[PDB]
């Protein structure tokens, strides 16, 4: 597991989404360097205009690139599931609005680490902060809490993302996540800890398609 991650690894992300019946697809590419907890990716909405704000999809768009200190390496479930991979599911509840349910598979295809996701969004308000596009194109840092889910031979993760609204307020996005290995192979189940994350969003001045450039750093801690 850990070995597949000692250098720079190419990443491919493919998402098929349907939010309140607005269908869309996104392809993303870049690379991850888990030694530094670093990810660099560019995402493109290949179906035209993205019908939701780009920051709402960041969490959905590869925790195996998190930087686990040497003393915590026995708690790295993510890389221990590789290369066969793991299934990652979430329900993301946007306060006072709709919710996303996602199902993704994260695994190696050759030397490329792939995240393939299906996202379904329902109960959004037509002119709410999401379908209405009222969110600032930026992103706050936060802590992602991980706990072992022994029953499933996997983990449960939970955390809150606060999206900045254009009026100065916050749109809370409550995430409930579960991961389970794809193989029948062994994995490492962790003690409780958290991932500290920071994300910067930008635009490629040369790009005419609707898109998002993402630079992220994540380090595990709390042990």
UniProtKB/Swiss-Prot annotation:
Reported effect, residue 62 to L: In EYFP; leads to yellow fluorescence, folds faster and more efficiently at 37 degrees Celsius and has superior solubility and brightness
PTM text: Contains a chromophore consisting of modified amino acid residues. Maturation of the chromophore requires nothing other than molecular oxygen.
Recorded consequence of changing residue 149 to V: In EBFP2.0; shifts the excitation and emission spectra to shorter wavelengths and increases quantum yields compared to BFP
Effect the entry attributes to changing residue 63 to L: In RSGFP4; increases fluorescence and shifts the major exitation peak to 489-490 nm
Phenotype when changing residue 139 to H: In mut1.3; shifts fluorescence lifetime from 3.03 to 2.78 ns. In mut1.5; shifts fluorescence lifetime from 3.03 to 2.72 ns. In mut1.27; shifts fluorescence lifetime from 3.03 to 2.85 ns
Tissue expression summary: Photocytes.
Effect of residue 157 to A: In GFPB; leads to enhanced fluorescence at 37 degrees Celsius
Effect of mutating residue 63 to M: In Citrinine; leads to excitation and emission peaks of 516 and 529 nm, respectively
GO aspect biological process, one term: bioluminescence
Outcome when changing residue 73 to R: In Topaz; shifts the major emission and exitation peak up to 20 nm
Family matches, as Gene3D superfamilies: Green fluorescent protein
Effect ascribed to mutating residue 63 to H: In P4; leads to no detectable fluorescence. In mut2.2; shifts fluorescence lifetime from 3.03 to 1.94 ns. In mut3.3; shifts fluorescence lifetime from 3.03 to 1.88 ns
Outcome after substituting residue 139 to F: In Sapphire/H9-40; exhibits a huge Stoke's shift, with an excitation peak at 399 nm and an emission peak at 511 nm. In Azurite; shifts the excitation and emission spectra to shorter wavelengths and increases quantum yields compared to BFP
Protein name: Green fluorescent protein
Taxonomic source organism: Aequorea victoria
Lineage: Eukaryota, Metazoa, Cnidaria, Hydrozoa, Hydroidolina
Gene designation per UniProt: GFP
């Amino acid at each position: 597991g850990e070995e597949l991650f000692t250098g720079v690894v190419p990443i491919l992300v493919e998402l098929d989404g349907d939010v309140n019946g607005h269908k869309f697809s996104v392809s993303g590419e870049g690379e991850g360097d888990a030694t530094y907890g670093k990810l660099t990716l560019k995402f493109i909405c290949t179906t035209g205009k993205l019908p939701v704000p780009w920051p709402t999809l960041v969490t959905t768009f590869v925790q195996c690139f998190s930087r686990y200190p040497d003393h915590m390496k026995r708690h790295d479930f993510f890389k221990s599931a590789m290369p066969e991979g793991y299934v990652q599911e979430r329900t993301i509840f946007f306060k006072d609005d709709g919710n996303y349910k996602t199902r993704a598979e994260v695994k190696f295809e050759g030397d490329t680490l792939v995240n393939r996701i299906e996202l379904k969004g329902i109960d959004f308000k037509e002119d709410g902060n999401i379908l209405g596009h009222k969110l600032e194109y930026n992103y706050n840092s936060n802590n992602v809490y991980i706990m072992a889910d022994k029953q499933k031979n996997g983990i449960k993760v939970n955390f809150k993302i606060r999206h900045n609204i254009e009026d100065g307020s916050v749109q809370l996005a409550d995430h409930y996540q579960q991961n389970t290995p794809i193989g029948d192979g062994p994995v490492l189940l962790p003690d409780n800890h958290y991932l500290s994350t920071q994300s910067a969003l930008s635009k490629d001045p040369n790009e005419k398609r609707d898109h998002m450039v993402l630079l992220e750093f994540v380090t595990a801690a709390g042990i």
